[PDB]
Amino acid sequence: GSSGSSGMVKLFIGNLPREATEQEIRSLFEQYGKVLECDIIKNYGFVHIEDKTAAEDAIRNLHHYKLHGVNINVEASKNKSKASSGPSSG
């Protein structure tokens, strides 16, 4: 992304079934933002979205998304960060 700075945002997905495919997962995210990378290992899957704001949208819904009779779990791997020291004026 341009407006932002951090860039892509990794996503953690656990409780994945056997029918689940790198694609099925990727697409699910492509609905709330284009995907960059997608892997599935150790009953877990990692999804990287374009912008951050897009990640939240996806995660939210995707969360508890009845997939193949299963309730996959979604969590924002890279949590947000707030600057404490200094008023961050500029």
UniProtKB/Swiss-Prot annotation:
A single GO BP: positive regulation of gene expression
Primary location group: nucleus
Domain RRM, first and last residues per copy: 9-79
UniProt superkingdom: Eukaryota
Protein name as it appears in the record: RNA-binding protein 4B
Complex formation: Interacts with TNPO3, which may mediate nuclear import of the protein.
MF terms in GO: RNA binding; zinc ion binding
Expression sites by tissue: Expressed in liver and kidney (at protein level). Ubiquitously expressed.
